[PDB]
Amino acid sequence: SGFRKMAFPSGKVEGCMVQVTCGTTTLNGLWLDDVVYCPRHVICTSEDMLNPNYEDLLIRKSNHNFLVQAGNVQLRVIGHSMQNCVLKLKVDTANPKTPKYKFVRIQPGQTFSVLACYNGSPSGVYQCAMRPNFTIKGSFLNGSCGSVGFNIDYDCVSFCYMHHMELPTGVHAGTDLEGNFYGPFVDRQTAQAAGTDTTITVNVLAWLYAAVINGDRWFLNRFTTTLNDFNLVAMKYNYEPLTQDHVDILGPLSAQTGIAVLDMCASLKELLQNGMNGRTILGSALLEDEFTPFDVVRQCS
Amino acid sequence: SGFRKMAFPSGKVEGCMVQVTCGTTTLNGLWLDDVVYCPRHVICTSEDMLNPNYEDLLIRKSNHNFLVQAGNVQLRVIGHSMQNCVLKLKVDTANPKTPKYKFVRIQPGQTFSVLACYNGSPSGVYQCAMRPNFTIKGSFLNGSCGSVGFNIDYDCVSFCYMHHMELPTGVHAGTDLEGNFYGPFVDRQTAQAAGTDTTITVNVLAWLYAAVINGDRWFLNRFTTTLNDFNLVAMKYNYEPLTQDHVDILGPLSAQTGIAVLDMCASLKELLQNGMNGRTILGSALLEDEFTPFDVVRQC
Ligand SMILES: Cc1cc(CNCCS(C)(=O)=O)ccc1Br
Ligand SMILES: [Cl-]
Ligand code: NA
């Protein structure tokens, strides 16, 4: 037993991290087959970043303006193009460490592992959720840009995130690997704030199941409720609505414990109103919302 | 900006994880050069659980009683020996993925990454600390036995923990990679209980210094304290005594932030007295004790 914020093993992704330099800017790229993926803002000077014309800045650029380094080996760039906010550098050599992979776009509430890198060198792994306001509460210092987020499904790496920038509040904004932003953000130096964030209700519920599975049962009660009743409470506390689909995804956990989602919703309703009466759940004084139902089943079963 | 329980990249450890089978028992082994390290309890059955005579059970085994599997490849055992509570199976192939490594025994309060593994397949990675009572609050199911804890400093993997057992309170007990247990525990399923756990005071202080660095000052006060007065208070909340060693260790974070170690100690005494009054520090509504002074300087 025990319950921890757990990342996927990072090794299949560590094998894909390179350093990309354009002028004075250095950051991380993802090397898969014969292409290196990195944020297009690597082509910007600090002057450029206030109002960049990426079209113009890039036609002015050529292959030789890009220094790709895989540890102690220079990769030769033989092509360059832009997909949305991502720069694709074609290289002369396929990554012999390319895993089975696809590019996937995640939904808010979904979790993924982040390999934090500095100078194309993997430094840390941590599990994140994509927030309802499309930011992530990561840990990123300068040179972190181009760090990626991923899931593993058997042998297949699903790449879902690339880090572009930190917002004024300390939270982070990035794209999928096709360079589409998550959330209403642009890759320019400008005034950008995260929306007011919400709590991922289905994830809180999943985590209450994890707590019960690990013997932390105090908050259970004899009561049940309804989606409509609960959701008027949720909306009140800046919780996402619980849909019937959320209820069905918790299904397995509802079985293994005998606590039906609206049964557990009544526990949660009461924690939102009355609080934790001091106590903790899985060594947290907060209602944790960065474990999905899948995460709880995966780690506990 | 941001502050997260960050684990080390697990890749150098993933290339060393194999499956070890003996009798009907399967758990994880660590493949470094021509040696596979696993818990010696792999050679026990039901009737050997309470009072295993390990020297007696191991002399009755031949090399071919051990089935070592690295993915699809079967490894050939050519030798076995026991060092303390760890079994060392010699194999005919050196692991070509062996990273630079060492074995270190850590002290309570130190942090490390765990790679939780089942059937020699890595399942996930998380950060832990050695608690003052010599347990770890891990996440471990049946079959995770022989999973390892490590640090990675400057490309060298420092192995500091191998998982052996879960105690009745749901916390975890293991050995260093020389097979010596952390704490008073033994590889017998005889009744054992960990000491009352305590909060790692030096870690809480480092994490408060981290809060100040990332721009949180709400919990500072105008007070200072003597070391001795701080300990008389902190022990009433089951906090570990703070030593002059702990004070020296915080000197850098003190100098970085301009707050004296004993001023920060006054702030902690007040937080223990008041709680957080509906506020958070680095996103926590509790006082975090699984970040070391070193960890806070690395991540920040
Ligand atoms: C002493 C000890 C023995 C065991 C024996 N394995 C557990 C079940 S079985 C019959 O498959 O081996 C485990 C841990 C310790 Br600690
Ligand atoms: Cl140590
Ligand atoms: Na209930």
XYZ file of C-alpha atoms in Angstrom, chain B:
300
model
C 9.209 29.649 -10.358
C 7.125 26.751 -8.864
C 8.154 24.080 -6.277
C 7.398 20.361 -6.799
C 8.487 16.998 -5.338
C 10.782 16.203 -8.260
C 12.274 12.701 -8.776
C 15.531 11.967 -10.684
C 15.225 10.826 -14.301
C 14.792 7.032 -13.947
C 16.444 5.873 -17.257
C 19.874 4.823 -15.845
C 17.996 2.691 -13.225
C 15.443 1.258 -15.749
C 18.278 -0.409 -17.777
C 19.349 -2.353 -14.560
C 15.948 -3.801 -13.471
C 15.427 -7.601 -14.012
C 13.008 -10.300 -12.750
C 14.376 -12.903 -10.202
C 12.397 -16.128 -9.562
C 13.115 -18.808 -6.909
C 10.494 -21.476 -6.047
C 7.100 -19.749 -6.686
C 8.562 -16.333 -5.515
C 9.128 -13.615 -8.193
C 10.477 -10.120 -7.299
C 12.883 -7.481 -8.780
C 16.706 -7.596 -8.999
C 19.257 -4.887 -9.761
C 21.670 -5.833 -12.618
C 25.035 -4.019 -12.311
C 28.086 -5.454 -14.197
C 27.916 -9.284 -13.802
C 25.926 -9.150 -10.458
C 22.134 -9.182 -9.777
C 21.264 -7.882 -6.264
C 17.913 -8.838 -4.702
C 16.386 -9.368 -1.212
C 17.585 -12.712 0.260
C 13.909 -13.422 1.306
C 13.417 -14.510 -2.395
C 14.721 -17.979 -1.205
C 11.925 -18.378 1.474
C 8.509 -20.193 1.410
C 5.458 -19.976 3.806
C 7.148 -22.120 6.553
C 10.434 -20.098 6.271
C 8.710 -16.698 6.907
C 8.892 -16.481 10.776
C 12.404 -17.857 11.443
C 14.239 -18.285 8.093
C 17.714 -19.887 8.492
C 19.136 -18.102 5.397
C 22.583 -19.861 5.478
C 20.695 -23.241 5.646
C 18.192 -22.342 2.825
C 20.945 -20.911 0.535
C 23.448 -23.855 0.823
C 20.567 -26.096 -0.571
C 20.264 -23.958 -3.770
C 22.209 -24.414 -7.028
C 22.769 -21.641 -9.613
C 19.917 -23.155 -11.752
C 17.270 -22.698 -8.944
C 17.460 -18.902 -9.797
C 15.617 -17.802 -13.018
C 16.869 -14.252 -13.898
C 15.041 -12.584 -16.844
C 16.152 -9.217 -18.395
C 13.124 -8.414 -20.622
C 12.994 -11.489 -22.935
C 16.652 -12.620 -22.355
C 17.188 -15.347 -19.690
C 20.472 -14.580 -17.799
C 22.627 -17.569 -16.693
C 23.474 -17.586 -12.929
C 27.093 -18.945 -12.481
C 27.453 -18.039 -8.759
C 25.498 -16.914 -5.646
C 26.531 -15.419 -2.269
C 24.775 -13.573 0.568
C 25.910 -10.233 2.034
C 23.804 -9.314 5.102
C 20.111 -9.342 3.867
C 20.954 -9.048 0.103
C 21.501 -11.998 -2.300
C 24.154 -11.490 -5.068
C 23.580 -13.797 -8.097
C 26.700 -13.797 -10.372
C 25.629 -14.003 -14.086
C 27.719 -14.776 -17.251
C 26.786 -11.390 -18.958
C 27.792 -7.892 -17.693
C 24.819 -5.476 -18.085
C 25.838 -3.317 -21.117
C 23.503 -0.557 -19.693
C 25.444 -0.412 -16.345
C 25.691 3.329 -15.538
C 28.436 4.939 -13.407
C 27.261 4.011 -9.876
C 28.105 3.683 -6.183
C 26.406 2.327 -3.039
C 25.797 4.804 -0.155
C 24.041 4.367 3.196
C 21.909 7.513 3.859
C 20.811 9.099 7.175
C 17.246 9.919 8.273
C 16.048 13.138 6.562
C 17.853 12.398 3.289
C 15.711 12.162 0.118
C 15.929 9.831 -2.893
C 13.897 8.681 -5.926
C 12.217 5.225 -5.909
C 11.581 3.326 -9.186
C 8.615 1.039 -8.291
C 8.940 -2.166 -10.416
C 6.873 -5.389 -10.855
C 8.228 -8.505 -12.683
C 11.408 -6.478 -13.422
C 9.259 -3.918 -15.372
C 9.489 -0.332 -14.055
C 5.988 1.043 -13.196
C 6.630 4.567 -11.801
C 9.024 6.951 -10.042
C 8.492 9.150 -6.943
C 10.547 11.083 -4.342
C 10.784 9.792 -0.709
C 12.721 10.650 2.498
C 14.212 8.278 5.070
C 11.977 9.111 8.073
C 13.658 9.554 11.507
C 12.193 6.100 12.451
C 14.148 4.504 9.502
C 11.032 3.772 7.391
C 9.900 5.287 4.085
C 6.326 6.285 3.203
C 6.357 4.632 -0.216
C 3.834 3.214 -2.678
C 4.469 -0.536 -2.980
C 2.193 -3.466 -3.929
C 3.010 -7.205 -3.757
C 5.831 -7.992 -6.273
C 7.570 -4.568 -5.838
C 9.993 -6.296 -3.380
C 13.619 -5.508 -4.482
C 12.694 -2.044 -5.980
C 15.506 0.536 -5.437
C 15.966 4.063 -4.188
C 18.644 6.274 -5.687
C 20.163 9.718 -6.212
C 21.805 10.876 -9.491
C 24.523 13.497 -8.875
C 26.572 14.607 -11.956
C 25.738 11.416 -14.070
C 26.717 8.990 -11.193
C 23.809 6.835 -9.827
C 24.100 6.513 -6.012
C 21.967 3.500 -4.892
C 20.857 3.948 -1.263
C 17.770 1.675 -0.749
C 16.390 -1.753 -1.765
C 12.751 -2.496 -0.735
C 12.205 -5.674 1.413
C 8.861 -5.399 3.338
C 5.725 -3.411 4.357
C 5.211 -3.061 8.162
C 1.667 -3.294 9.670
C 1.242 0.551 9.720
C 1.548 0.652 5.867
C 5.154 2.078 5.835
C 8.155 0.386 4.165
C 11.447 -1.096 5.391
C 14.546 -1.991 3.363
C 18.357 -2.154 3.276
C 21.273 -0.352 1.679
C 22.810 -2.221 -1.292
C 25.242 -3.928 1.184
C 22.086 -5.616 2.643
C 22.120 -3.806 6.044
C 18.588 -2.758 7.166
C 17.749 0.881 7.894
C 16.514 0.869 11.493
C 15.930 -2.030 13.889
C 14.132 -4.274 11.310
C 14.844 -7.904 10.238
C 13.705 -9.983 7.190
C 11.404 -12.151 9.420
C 7.550 -11.897 9.338
C 7.674 -11.899 13.208
C 5.807 -8.900 14.801
C 7.865 -5.673 14.344
C 6.767 -2.010 14.669
C 8.576 1.227 13.694
C 9.316 3.865 16.385
C 6.940 6.866 16.713
C 7.656 8.993 13.601
C 8.798 12.642 13.881
C 8.950 15.630 11.527
C 12.320 16.346 9.872
C 12.854 19.884 11.326
C 15.933 20.759 9.165
C 13.871 19.936 5.998
C 10.853 22.078 7.131
C 13.256 25.058 7.695
C 14.855 24.626 4.201
C 11.347 24.524 2.669
C 10.396 27.739 4.591
C 13.607 29.364 3.154
C 12.389 28.040 -0.274
C 8.985 29.772 0.347
C 10.827 33.109 1.058
C 12.989 32.697 -2.131
C 9.815 32.091 -4.305
C 8.379 35.301 -2.656
C 6.252 34.177 0.400
C 6.933 36.185 3.667
C 3.470 36.123 5.367
C 4.692 33.639 8.114
C 7.876 35.573 9.133
C 7.766 37.377 12.505
C 10.008 39.898 14.322
C 11.102 37.211 16.867
C 14.245 35.123 17.263
C 14.836 32.162 19.595
C 17.729 30.306 21.299
C 18.523 26.879 19.807
C 17.593 25.337 23.184
C 14.217 27.157 23.506
C 13.364 26.151 19.880
C 13.964 22.421 20.677
C 11.898 22.479 23.948
C 8.970 23.822 21.820
C 9.561 21.708 18.640
C 9.691 18.431 20.633
C 6.187 19.121 22.041
C 4.942 18.716 18.391
C 7.063 15.532 17.658
C 9.625 17.546 15.617
C 13.200 16.161 15.552
C 15.744 18.081 17.671
C 17.593 20.677 15.552
C 21.429 20.326 16.016
C 24.263 22.839 15.406
C 24.990 20.657 12.309
C 21.448 21.487 11.006
C 22.111 25.244 11.693
C 25.438 25.123 9.770
C 23.740 23.216 6.888
C 21.144 26.090 6.538
C 23.873 28.879 6.547
C 23.734 29.221 2.702
C 19.876 29.645 2.564
C 20.202 32.067 5.579
C 22.784 34.174 3.615
C 20.778 33.934 0.337
C 17.552 35.239 2.045
C 19.136 37.447 4.804
C 17.029 35.622 7.512
C 19.072 34.090 10.423
C 18.485 30.340 11.084
C 17.161 31.180 14.593
C 14.762 33.879 13.139
C 13.346 31.215 10.779
C 13.149 28.915 13.891
C 10.923 31.594 15.605
C 8.666 31.628 12.454
C 8.350 27.765 12.599
C 7.479 27.905 16.396
C 4.665 30.404 15.527
C 3.346 28.304 12.570
C 3.152 25.225 14.949
C 1.213 27.402 17.462
C -1.157 29.052 14.880
C -1.502 26.705 11.871
C -1.841 28.524 8.496
C -5.240 30.254 9.034
C -6.584 29.046 5.607
C -3.309 29.973 3.780
C -0.759 27.763 1.929
C 3.047 27.737 1.644
C 4.461 26.695 -1.798
C 0.976 25.196 -2.492
C 0.796 23.109 0.752
C -1.570 23.586 3.767
C 0.877 21.422 5.852
C 4.584 21.943 6.725
C 6.614 19.864 4.156
C 9.584 17.842 5.535
C 10.710 15.786 2.432
C 12.907 18.558 0.822
C 16.571 18.678 2.065
C 18.644 21.918 2.188
C 20.618 20.536 -0.827
C 17.316 19.749 -2.714
C 16.063 23.371 -2.121
C 19.319 24.870 -3.598
C 19.252 22.398 -6.591
C 15.522 22.977 -7.528
C 15.647 26.855 -6.910
